[PDB]
Amino acid sequence: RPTFYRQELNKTIWEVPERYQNLSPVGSGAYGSVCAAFDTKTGHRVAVKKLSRPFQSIIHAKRTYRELRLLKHMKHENVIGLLDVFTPARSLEEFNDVYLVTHLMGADLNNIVKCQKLTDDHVQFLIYQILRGLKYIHSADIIHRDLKPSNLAVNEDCELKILDFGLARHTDDEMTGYVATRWYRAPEIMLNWMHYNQTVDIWSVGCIMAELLTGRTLFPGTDHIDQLKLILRLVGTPGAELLKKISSESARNYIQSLAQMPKMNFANVFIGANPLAVDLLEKMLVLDSDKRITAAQALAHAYFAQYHDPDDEPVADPYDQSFESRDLLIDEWKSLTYDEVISFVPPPL
């Protein structure tokens, strides 16, 4: 066991291995806060996330386990992975706190679009890296579900990594960042139209891409109906098939209540854009989930011709999500989480 040391940080206590030095807050992450640190063992800059009351509810505890299992599985350049996971506890019996460690990233795309204009070349490379991570995540049968600029970590040299993937599970659940999440949400999940799938994430990438190009939120809805008004204003109203694919007879009656809006031609919307970028957008922001381009197809699109490499766009190993169907107490989620902390093997140095 390493020697730990203690320190207070944004009015919470941090107990970490002595290798991690110079802790400095850089904000909040999914159910916790994050400090930058320097790891005197490897010479790397790291981000250390302390989970917030990880076992103070069943929802929290199960989310803790989910998150630790995901982060242990993800091994990809464009997805946040784990350098270290630790706890100051010497046994299950005193286990209360969980800390996760990854490579320090310099900013997120939300703060990026907020302080500079991006050129088409930046947009190309940023979007490429998102679709590349997403092809990986999706190959493991994981859906991000909450893709948004603040969940995309970037460095000064335009390197990007996805984070907070696979942590959402219900639109009935309370979570932070709800209003921003909605701006990028595919309409079928937002409004529970049908059983959804992983194409929800491509709608989100289309929204983000439109935003990186223009510097403005594409669909800044104030609530569910307003959000829907804004979407249909661009993509038009749902044609023939799609209404036949809305089980949600409540949404369906509401929708056909709405007077027809036509589909705009994106070339006429996004003035000054690379026609390739416009044509990718056309393929991502289709109302019919069945008709959206997949991550893997999108990488082959000519917009990314300069970065695309079919032999360096890998898929993921099998990932067991069978725990998701289980109904357990806080202490059983705790013990599972402890197991995963103990069995952690750090990646190749």
Partner: peptide
């Protein structure tokens, strides 16, 4: 409505971002 791009595309190589403080 039109939403012009921040930087109109021009027909023609290393990328950087200014980091927030």
């Amino acid at each position: 409505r039109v939403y012009p791009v921040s930087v109109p595309y021009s027909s023609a190589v290393t990328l950087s971002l200014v980091m927030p403080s």
